Design a protein around this motif. Structure first.
Motif, short mmCIF file in Angstrom:
data_model
loop_
_atom_site.label_atom_id
_atom_site.label_comp_id
_atom_site.label_asym_id
_atom_site.label_seq_id
_atom_site.Cartn_x
_atom_site.Cartn_y
_atom_site.Cartn_z
N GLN A 199 0.81 -1.21 0.00
CA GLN A 199 0.00 0.00 0.00
C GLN A 199 0.85 1.26 0.00
OE1 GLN A 199 -3.90 -1.73 2.42
NE2 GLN A 199 -2.21 -0.73 3.50
N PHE A 200 2.16 1.14 -0.17
CA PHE A 200 3.02 2.31 -0.25
C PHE A 200 2.63 3.15 -1.46
CE2 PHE A 200 6.77 4.62 -1.58
CZ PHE A 200 7.18 5.20 -0.40
N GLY A 201 2.53 4.46 -1.25
CA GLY A 201 2.08 5.37 -2.28
C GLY A 201 0.59 5.63 -2.27
N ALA A 202 -0.17 4.92 -1.45
CA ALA A 202 -1.60 5.12 -1.31
C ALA A 202 -1.89 5.77 0.03
CB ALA A 202 -2.36 3.79 -1.43
N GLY A 203 -2.72 6.80 0.03
CA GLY A 203 -3.03 7.54 1.24
C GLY A 203 -2.06 8.68 1.49
N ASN A 204 -2.40 9.49 2.49
CA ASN A 204 -1.60 10.66 2.84
C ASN A 204 -1.02 10.57 4.24
OD1 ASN A 204 -3.19 11.28 0.53
ND2 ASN A 204 -2.90 13.47 0.89
N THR A 205 -0.91 9.36 4.80
CA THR A 205 -0.31 9.16 6.11
C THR A 205 0.77 8.09 6.01
OG1 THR A 205 -1.99 7.52 6.74
CG2 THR A 205 -2.40 9.82 7.33
N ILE A 206 1.88 8.34 6.69
CA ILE A 206 2.97 7.37 6.80
C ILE A 206 3.41 7.33 8.25
CG2 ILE A 206 5.41 6.98 6.31
CD1 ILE A 206 3.61 5.93 4.18
N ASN A 207 3.55 6.13 8.81
CA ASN A 207 3.93 5.98 10.20
C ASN A 207 5.41 5.64 10.31
OD1 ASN A 207 1.11 5.93 10.08
ND2 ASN A 207 0.95 4.75 11.98
N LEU A 208 6.14 6.46 11.06
CA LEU A 208 7.49 6.14 11.49
C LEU A 208 7.41 5.46 12.85
CD1 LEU A 208 9.44 9.37 10.53
CD2 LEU A 208 9.04 7.31 9.19
N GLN A 209 7.94 4.26 12.94
CA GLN A 209 7.87 3.44 14.14
C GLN A 209 9.23 3.49 14.82
OE1 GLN A 209 5.02 0.33 11.65
NE2 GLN A 209 7.22 0.02 11.95
N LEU A 210 9.27 4.05 16.02
CA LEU A 210 10.51 4.14 16.77
C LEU A 210 10.98 2.75 17.18
CD1 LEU A 210 9.40 7.13 17.01
CD2 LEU A 210 10.49 7.15 19.25
N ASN A 211 12.29 2.53 17.09
CA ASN A 211 12.85 1.24 17.50
C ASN A 211 12.67 1.00 18.99
OD1 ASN A 211 13.64 0.80 14.84
ND2 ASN A 211 15.67 1.68 15.17
N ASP A 212 12.88 2.03 19.81
CA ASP A 212 12.68 1.96 21.25
C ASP A 212 11.62 2.97 21.65
OD1 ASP A 212 12.80 1.82 24.05
OD2 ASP A 212 14.96 1.44 24.04
N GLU A 213 10.65 2.53 22.44
CA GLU A 213 9.53 3.38 22.82
C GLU A 213 10.00 4.49 23.76
OE1 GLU A 213 9.12 2.39 26.15
OE2 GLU A 213 10.22 0.51 25.93
N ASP A 214 9.62 5.72 23.44
CA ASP A 214 9.93 6.87 24.28
C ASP A 214 9.03 8.04 23.91
OD1 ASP A 214 11.09 8.43 26.18
OD2 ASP A 214 12.99 8.73 25.13
N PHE A 215 8.29 8.57 24.88
CA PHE A 215 7.45 9.73 24.61
C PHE A 215 8.29 10.95 24.26
CE2 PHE A 215 4.69 7.02 27.17
CZ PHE A 215 3.54 7.04 26.41
N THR A 216 9.40 11.14 24.97
CA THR A 216 10.27 12.28 24.67
C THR A 216 10.86 12.17 23.27
OG1 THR A 216 12.13 11.17 25.74
CG2 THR A 216 10.80 12.66 27.08
N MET A 217 11.31 10.98 22.88
CA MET A 217 11.89 10.82 21.54
C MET A 217 10.83 10.94 20.46
SD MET A 217 15.01 10.85 21.35
CE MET A 217 14.96 10.50 19.60
N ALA A 218 9.63 10.41 20.70
CA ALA A 218 8.55 10.57 19.73
C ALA A 218 8.21 12.05 19.55
CB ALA A 218 7.33 9.78 20.18
N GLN A 219 8.10 12.79 20.66
CA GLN A 219 7.81 14.21 20.56
C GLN A 219 8.95 14.96 19.88
OE1 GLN A 219 4.86 15.70 21.32
NE2 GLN A 219 5.84 17.42 20.27
N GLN A 220 10.19 14.55 20.12
CA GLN A 220 11.33 15.22 19.51
C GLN A 220 11.35 15.00 18.00
OE1 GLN A 220 14.21 15.01 22.37
NE2 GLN A 220 15.15 16.94 21.72
N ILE A 221 11.08 13.77 17.55
CA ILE A 221 10.99 13.53 16.12
C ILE A 221 9.83 14.30 15.52
CG2 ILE A 221 10.73 11.77 14.35
CD1 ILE A 221 12.09 9.81 16.05
N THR A 222 8.70 14.36 16.23
CA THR A 222 7.56 15.13 15.73
C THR A 222 7.92 16.60 15.55
OG1 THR A 222 6.04 13.59 16.82
CG2 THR A 222 5.17 15.73 16.17
N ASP A 223 8.61 17.18 16.53
CA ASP A 223 9.02 18.57 16.43
C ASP A 223 10.10 18.79 15.38
OD1 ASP A 223 7.25 19.33 18.44
OD2 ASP A 223 8.73 19.01 20.03
N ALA A 224 10.94 17.79 15.12
CA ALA A 224 11.98 17.94 14.11
C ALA A 224 11.40 17.88 12.71
CB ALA A 224 13.05 16.87 14.30
#
Lengths: 37, 303, 303, 303
Positions: C148-173
């Motif tokens: 389904q790559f190329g279909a839709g307007n959402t793509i999920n980046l899955q962090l290798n290690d779970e972290d709210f701070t790292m998820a928020q940091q990638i979101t802000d970057a």
């Protein structure tokens, strides 16, 4: 005399349908326990 | 980094996955397969699945195949396609798993559902364990767990160690940098925080919360004794009272009854206990006897 | 290169392929074939397919043939005609696979469908493993997977290690170099990004995203102990509290109870723990006892 | 030469061919033929075809004949009359194939159709393998494969390793020296190029494309560990974080817990890891433990 209707010894149903199980809760756990006795 | 190192988020937890597999490629260090029928039975199952039907009445005596159990942790918010590490442990009379390869193994949950598929090369140390290895990124997640994260306006931080003072301190710390009523302690181990409605909003809120630093308050006085490893560990809040200690082959250096000076801080305790000249094996008995008498003003735990 | 090294793209994943084959050309170091009937059975199958029907009642005692299992990884977006590496592992009582050649082997998926065909020359190291080898470009992809790559307007980046701070940091970057609302974190492990509709557009967007650099935030304090290999690894965020440690045959260099100085950074922790003069086997027990007592302010994991 | 070394053309692929044959002229180092009935059976088949019918009930005990499997690669766009190299591997209890000659062998495909005919003299090295040899130009192509090359206006370049950045870079490189819309990336592994209608036109276009040079972008950080050969390879993008490492019989040169300095580039990583004074067997366990803890900021693969 063998045609007379008779009541068997083990009355009732001789089978039980397995009841479907509760829907797991959304707590992030794989282990889900039905209402514990 | 204090709040993340002290608490855990409600619903953000790790599950345990287990499965059975075969390890092939061993240098003659696999099962005997004459005393472990399941190894040959499952090898025949694999061959039958792959298209080879070995006759039922036959003798297979393998040496490069071992039947193993694979264990892994299902991480929080795991998504299908991600990889996790697995631990591979031999199950019957196998000499080693040095350079074996784990064949396709389905990792089941407690509910007996496949959550991951495991296959890879085992890394064995090489006094090192030979029947146990680890495969990094050896399993791929195949199933996801629904969660309630992002729903509701309450999130519970669960303290790793129960403490009313620490719970109140975290409550006051969250309520200093994040508004007046942003946190309320529910018990000695739970702090309920009010989060905005949404999914990314709660992520941002918890990112803020997790890296906050709280001043850790004195935390109970306890002496941990591990008799199986012969170790004693005392934290800072352990004190002593003045009392006399006697034990075999220990003497004042001049009788056998040595006076232990009352002690306020941990350095005083260490000096007083080293004045006895006691081996840790003797020190464990000394500490237990002093706890019985009442000199040792700490909680003695035997682990 | 931070985002690519920290996350993975949704739908861009590797599968596992498995198959059974024969390795020929060994210098008398193959199966005994009297204890592994499947080797001779599958050799007879191959001959029957090729046009030679060996009588059912006969004794074949080979020495240059070994029955092996071949494992490979099906790469993301694999197209038919491409080549992948395979791992060849012996399955029964074979001495070595030194210079063998893997015959035509169909690599099945979990769905028992052929996705690759494997055939090549095995490379065995030559304390080296003899029943396990690797063939580079030894298998050719024969089937492709729809995506389904190329279909839709959402793509999920899955962090290798779970972290709210790292998820928020990638979101802000992502939301700094790629527009205001280009990324939204969904949980501690997932960042949803908004991508243009199309196939090449998403490729370009993800190419931009992947090489961005994010400042990694402090990430939990943990001490990893591997008892099977006898190793201990502590990250930077591990601290200590002042407490006394006693263990067998260890003494102050003068009693057996040694005071461990509170420690703030990792260098202080290393110096304090080296002051005890403890072997890593003893250090593992010391760390476990200190975690029980409360001196060790870190998460002790046993791998 | 970058594009040819990085990608492959769609439809330009190599197939695998397999066949069974006999090798004659060995110096008493062939099959025993009492434990490998197929050798004598196929020799009798060859004689019967050539005009000699040996009686069914008879004992043939040969020493200069070995039954072998021949493997080859069917090259792209192969035309009948061309020659390819073959690999000859013994199949049962043969001592050597030193100076043998491969008799006429039909090399079948997956579809069990003859695509090549093999016959020649085997070259065996002479710690060298004796039951495996190679014949250069030992097989002649007898069948051709139809192809769709030259039909349509799209050609797919398939990247050897999946990368969105590399796919986008190849797309931008083709679209710089060959027009505005000459290439479009479809996924992380495929670049679709627009080619003129025709056969020689596409050949010319691909000749231009193949020798173009693309600037390779940073490509993931990974540490490859081969436990079966005991080797570790780290690429340039591997970094480290400051953390403490302890392992058996390793000490600071003075405790057993050695601090590993954070490291940015690969030279720093090599110096920090060599400061531990660790054998590669110990280094593998150290790297696995550091990956578990989080010091090692790379992808650890076990091959």
């Amino acid at each position: 005399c063998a045609w007379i209707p008779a009541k068997p010894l083990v009355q009732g149903a001789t089978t039980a349908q397995p009841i479907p199980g509760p829907v797991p809760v959304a707590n992030g756990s794989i282990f889900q326990s039905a209402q514990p006795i | 980094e204090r709040i993340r190192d002290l608490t855990s988020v409600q619903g953000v937890r790790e599950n345990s996955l287990i499965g059975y597999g075969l390890v092939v490629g061993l240098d003659g260090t696999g099962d005997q397969t004459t005393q472990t029928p399941f190894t040959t039975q499952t090898l025949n199952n694999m061959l039958s699945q792959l298209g080879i039907t070995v006759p039922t009445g036959t003798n297979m005596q393998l040496k490069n195949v071992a039947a193993v159990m694979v264990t892994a942790s299902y991480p929080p918010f795991a998504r299908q396609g991600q990889t996790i590490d697995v631990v591979v442990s031999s199950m019957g009379n196998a000499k080693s798993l040095r350079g074996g390869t784990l064949l396709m193994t389905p990792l089941k949950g407690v509910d007996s559902q496949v959550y991951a598929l495991a296959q890879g090369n085992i890394l064995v140390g090489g006094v090192n364990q030979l029947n146990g290895g680890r495969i990094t990124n050896g399993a791929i997640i195949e199933r996801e767990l629904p969660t309630q994260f992002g729903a509701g306006n309450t999130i519970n931080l669960q303290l790793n160690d129960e403490d009313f003072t620490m719970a109140q301190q975290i409550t006051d710390a969250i309520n200093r940098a994040r508004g007046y009523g942003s946190a309320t302690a529910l018990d000695a181990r739970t702090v309920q925080v009010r989060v905005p409605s949404g999914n990314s909003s709660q992520v941002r809120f918890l990112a803020d919360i997790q890296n906050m630093e709280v001043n850790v308050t004195p935390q109970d006085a306890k002496v941990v004794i591990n008799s199986r490893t012969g170790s004693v560990v005392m934290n800072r809040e352990v004190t002593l009272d003045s009392c006399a200690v006697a034990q075999g082959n220990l003497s004042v250096t001049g009788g056998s009854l040595q006076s232990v000076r009352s002690s306020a801080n941990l350095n005083s305790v260490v000096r007083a206990l080293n004045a006895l000249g006691a081996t840790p094996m003797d020190l464990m008995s000394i500490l237990q006897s002093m706890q019985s008498a009442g000199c040792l003003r700490a909680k003695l735990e035997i682990i």
